[PDB]
From a paper:
Previous studies suggest mitochondrial ABCB7-type exporters are involved in maturation of cytosolic iron-sulfur proteins. Here, we report a series of cryo-electron microscopy structures of a eukaryotic homolog of human ABCB7, [name], determined at average resolutions ranging from 2.8 to 3.2 Å, complemented by functional characterization and molecular docking in silico. We propose that [name] accepts delivery from glutathione-complexed iron-sulfur clusters. As anticipated, the architecture of [name] harbors the classical ABC-fold, packing into a homodimer with six transmembrane segments (TM1–TM6) in each monomer.
To generate an occluded configuration, we again exploited the E603Q form, but this time we supplemented the sample with ATP and cargo, thereby resembling conditions previously exploited to catch such a state of NaAtm130. Then, the cluster in the sample was replaced with GSSG, which permitted us to determine a structure at an average resolution of 2.8 Å, CtAtm1occl. In contrast to previous forms, this sample demonstrates well-defined NBDs in which two ATP molecules are readily identified in the cryo-EM density in proximity to Y450, K480, S481, and Q603. As anticipated, this structure is alike the equivalent state of ScAtm1 and AtAtm3 (RMSD 1.6 and 1.4 Å). Indeed, surface analysis reveals the TM-domain to remain inaccessible from the intermembrane space of mitochondria, but now also from the matrix side. Yet, TM6 remains kinked in the structure, in contrast to occluded states of NaAtm1. In this light, we conclude the structure likely represents an early fully occluded state, triggered by the supplementation of cargo and/or nucleotide. The overall location of the CtAtm1occl pocket across the matrix-membrane interface between TM2, TM3 and TM 6 has essentially not been altered vis-à-vis the matrix-exposed cavity present in the inward-facing conformations, and the highly electropositive surface charge is also maintained. However, interestingly, in the cargo-binding region next to F396, the pocket is divided by residue pairs Y232, V400, and E403 aligning directly each side of the pocket with the two pathways separated by the TM6 linking pairs that are present in our other [name] structures. Continued passage through the TM-domain is however restricted by the now enlarged inner gate, consisting of H240, F396, and S399.
Residue numbers in the entry:
A (entry chain A), B (entry chain B): 92 to 678
The structure:
């Protein structure tokens, strides 16, 4: 299972473009091998010191150079060389690992921004970004563990087994092979038993994080309804589950490490018994026994390093499948192949044909819908609340596809049109208008990020917000706060209208753009919007509950129960005495 | 500096309540000392094996029991005992560490929920929860490092210095003291040089995380204005800064580890030179030399463990000051001492007296404001957009304090009244109404979490939303999505009205509660709200831009430029021919 994830992740070890990080990888591998070779030499120099001081105890000599000085310096310099080269390849491979981090994070964020609207509506705000940054931390930790601690250790077992089989009998090879067999059997058994606790801890951690994020987003809601203790209790219960699972994780890791060190230390005892038997039989010397012990002990050091941090490693593994499964989710809003960009031969003629749509398959909202928005005219869509008139503005934008029927913009099915050209041809003021946690000028220029300050000021006049922004102390640098909450709702809505004005699209969709404005302000703003639409011959589609802003619309579409019940102008709908008349007579 | 943070954190080692986690701490410390003692015995048993196999090479014997069997088993069993007791105290102290994690996280979340509104408006959504969970990870990692790797290592230097000074000369004590001096000097110098890179990496990581979170919150904004590439580029630049700083961090950690291992291995070489000189002079034996080397090497193992994970440790330290500084921020909205709960002798008579307020000190918004909301009457506050009429509803709630003047609810200054009683006496429908990412029924029952299903259904009828919820497939279990975006805005607003209805407060504040509703729906909802207010004699304060919902209000307050320009009823404001007349004649 996880072998597939490791195979997919291995492409970041071997990039095919830069060729300089390839040189860094090769240099890190060469320093890895050199460090392991020096680390395996240092027991040989210790054996040489032991033997030269043991056999030369009878003759009188000095330790400066006569007996053991050169090999003392050799031992010290080889220890220094081993550790220095290990840290040097750590420093070298750090750059490759961090470049892989930035590339993975940017790619995954870019895939997130192209996912469907339904996924982003049904997710949790904290969960996605937690998956992103925790997955990047996982990539970094797992790459650094595999290159820094796992491969060097496996190479250490390789050379230790080879040297103990070469310089000594096959008995040591048999002992170490049985040790690796028992070690692997114990490790896989206890890992198959440790997986439940570690996935439960991750699930409870995610639950606690989502509780905290959802409580902090709705801080005004928790203070308005005095549910601070309720949110604290919810967070506390989630953390109770998390600490129970984490205690089980740690308690079962201290069984893994304990048992695998039982196996390793029993191996060390048996090998030292074989060495003692060899020493007493005259085959081996004291230095050979200390060589055996030192080799196996220097093998122990990386092994209990891996045992100590196994929690973080395998945590990064389940972070691997959660982030990669986030990358593997498909998009249901896909461009048809060989798709031409959207063209507007005449004005933005929008035509719905037999459109049937429901976010849930058992509840159709638009039911056999068929409406024709004329080209270049101001068109108003009215109706009861929840009737499905702001679901036009997100299904015409192709955030959702109809189950039946087709949508045409100038006789072009929007399914057979590139998403990029369609979404640049449509500008919409959303019903709720959250702003980025930045200044006023940045939020205004978000409509066209490469627009100059004069265009931003012009869109500020056209949205009837500029004089207020001048009257403020910070001017256009006034911070709007989190989700545009440090300014008033009417000013925030006018900023959204300013974004639409600065974008200047052929198709304009206003989803109650004057809902939070007083009568004078909405009157002036509607005057500016109407003269913009009439001057540029834009196809403007106004979804509005305030009928007094759209009584001069060219076409008024009354939408009830997801079907057009009546169309026509204001006066025609008055002599129809229909649903629009009942809406208007109720003032 | 950081010593103060460690002192403050040390209270979680010594809890004063449970006394059972105190027993766990003592058991972990006892197993710590026992494991270190056994780990220091195992070189002594290796020395004994070496000596018994060296001096007894002349006489013929077997290794089973005659020469070295008992001490081979002693060596192996002591190694097993050391590692087993180390992992056992890790398992024991894990529970104490995790309980400290849950307590710290719950306390810090609770302090966050009681902070000021201004702090929550001016913060970043990702940043606070990232600080919380990353600080909890820091608490866990730093406690486990200090009890698991730092104190055991310091105890190891203690016993290694003591044993080498006891069994051998003062020369080894002088060498090891000079080694500790050089080690500490190098470590503090390179740590003072490493702090810049590690704080820059944390700052860039926070910047990248905030960019990602702000982009994902505004997914509809980035798709509506086609700024996916812009957000990807912003995230990529932040990640560029992060990877540059992380590469510098790792490159400077591989200098710390390299140099401190230079110092340690030079110490080991010098001590083995002294041991060789002692062996050649007849004072020492071969086993004593291997004892020296084994003691110092088993000291090396924890030291390069700390060197390998020093990044994570000191990262947890700067997480310590960021989370603790989050806990040290004060609240400016504080209850007066000896504060009595809010009483309502007559109805909810609200009176503003000379109130002067501005979120920025250089821009007053309410300027010498003086209005008197009568008791038990429906009162409407109208005015231009941005005039400061929804800043009444958050300054009467005491989310902000006035700079000058006082606010009275039944002749009780709300500054001299407990926040809990004041905020339970006030229920408000906010201007924007985000919902929790849960079902419809949970969002409705958030008004009173301990209310039964019949009361939830009753508030659903009174908010004119129930029949729609029945018509849905999932009923009251319909998920509303992130921030209530998987339902329509009118239905979301009616759910907020339902929360206010279920809360049933004495004071009702509606901040444009019918802004996203059609004329029939707002007419029916206003009928239900008006009969609720009249039946229970509630003091209802309606902030509304739709004047047709509040033409029957008992008092209409016209608020322009932050001062009451005119009051009175609808008819009186008509014969005044003032600002309200100009609002109404503009229809
Ligand atoms: N995923 C979804 N996204 C949007 N609406 C959904 C979804 N699932 C179910 N619905 C329901 O489908 C209906 C679609 O109506 P729509 O959202 O267009 O109303 P609206 O025109 O926005 O009304 P208003 O503008 O007054 O809020 C809503 O009542 C909503 O409750
Ligand atoms: N942190 C802040 N939160 C809210 N408003 C702020 C803040 N800082 C400054 N302001 C300004 O203070 C004024 C307060 O007015 P308020 O937000 O009550 O207007 P409003 O009643 O919401 O008008 P509308 O309902 O038409 O948007 C606003 O004009 C706003 O620009
Ligand atoms: Mg709508
Ligand atoms: Mg308002």
């Amino acid at each position: 299972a996880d072998w597939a994830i490791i195979k997919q992740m291995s492409r970041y070890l071997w990039p095919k473009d830069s060729w300089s990080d390839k040189a860094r990888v090769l240099l890190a591998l060469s320093l890895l091998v050199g460090g392991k070779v020096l680390n395996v030499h240092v027991p040989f120099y210790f054996r040489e010191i032991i033997d030269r001081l043991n056999i030369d105890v009878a003759a009188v000599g000095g330790t400066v150079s006569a007996v053991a000085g050169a090999v003392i310096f050799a031992y010290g310099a080889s220890r220094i060389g081993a550790v220095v080269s290990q840290e040097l390849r750590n420093a070298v491979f750090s750059s490759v690992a961090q470049k892989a981090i930035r590339r993975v994070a940017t790619q995954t964020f870019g895939h997130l921004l192209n996912l469907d609207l339904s996924f982003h509506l049904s997710k949790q705000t904290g969960g996605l970004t937690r998956a992103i940054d925790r997955g990047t931390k996982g990539i970094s930790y797992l790459l650094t563990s595999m290159v820094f601690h796992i491969v060097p250790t496996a190479l250490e077992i390789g050379m230790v087994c080879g040297i103990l089989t070469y310089q000594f009998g096959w008995e040591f090879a048999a002992i170490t092979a049985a040790t690796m067999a028992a070690y692997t059997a114990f490790t896989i058994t206890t890992t198959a038993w440790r997986t439940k606790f570690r996935r439960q801890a991750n699930a409870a951690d995610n639950a606690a994080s989502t509780v905290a994020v959802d409580s902090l987003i709705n801080y005004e809601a928790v203070k308005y309804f005095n549910n601070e203790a309720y949110e604290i209790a919810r967070y506390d219960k989630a953390l109770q589950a998390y600490e129970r699972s984490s205690i089980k994780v740690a308690t079962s890791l201290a069984f893994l490490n304990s048992g695998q060190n039982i196996i390793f230390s029993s191996a060390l005892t048996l090998m030292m018994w074989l060495g003692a038997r060899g020493v007493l039989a005259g085959d081996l010397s004291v230095g050979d026994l200390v060589l055996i012990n030192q080799l196996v002990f220097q093998l122990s050091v990386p092994l209990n390093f891996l045992g100590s941090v196994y929690r973080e490693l395998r945590q990064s593994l389940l972070d691997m499948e959660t982030l990669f499964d986030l990358q593997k989710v498909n998009v249901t809003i896909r461009e048809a192949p060989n798709a031409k960009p959207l063209a507007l031969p005449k004005g933005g003629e929008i035509r719905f044909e037999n459109v049937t749509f429901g976010y849930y398959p058992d509840r159709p909202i638009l039911r056999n819908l068929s409406l024709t928005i004329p080209a270049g005219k101001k068109v108003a869509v009215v109706g009861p609340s929840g009737c499905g008139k702001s679901t036009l503005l997100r299904l015409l934008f192709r955030s959702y596809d109809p189950q039946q029927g087709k949508i045409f913009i100038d006789d072009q099915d929007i399914k057979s049109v590139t998403l990029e050209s369609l979404r640049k041809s449509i500008g919409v003021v959303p019903q709720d208008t959250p702003l980025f946690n930045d200044t006023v000028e940045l939020n205004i220029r978000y409509g066209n990020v490469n627009a100059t300050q004069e265009q931003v000021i012009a869109a500020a006049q056209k949205a009837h917000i500029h004089e207020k922004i001048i009257s403020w102390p910070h001017g256009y640098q006034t911070r709007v706060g989190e989700r545009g909450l440090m300014i008033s709702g009417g000013e925030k809505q006018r900023l959204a209208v300013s974004r639409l004005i600065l974008k200047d699209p052929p198709l304009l969709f206003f989803d109650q753009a004057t809902s939070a404005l007083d009568t004078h302000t909405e009157q002036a703003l509607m005057a500016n919007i109407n003269e913009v639409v009439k001057e540029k011959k834009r196809t403007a589609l106004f979804v509005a509950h305030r009928l007094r802003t759209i009584y001069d619309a060219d076409l008024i579409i009354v939408l009830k129960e997801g079907v057009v019940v009546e169309q026509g102008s204001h006066r025609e709908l008055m002599e129809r005495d229909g649903v629009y008349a009942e809406l208007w007579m109720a003032q």
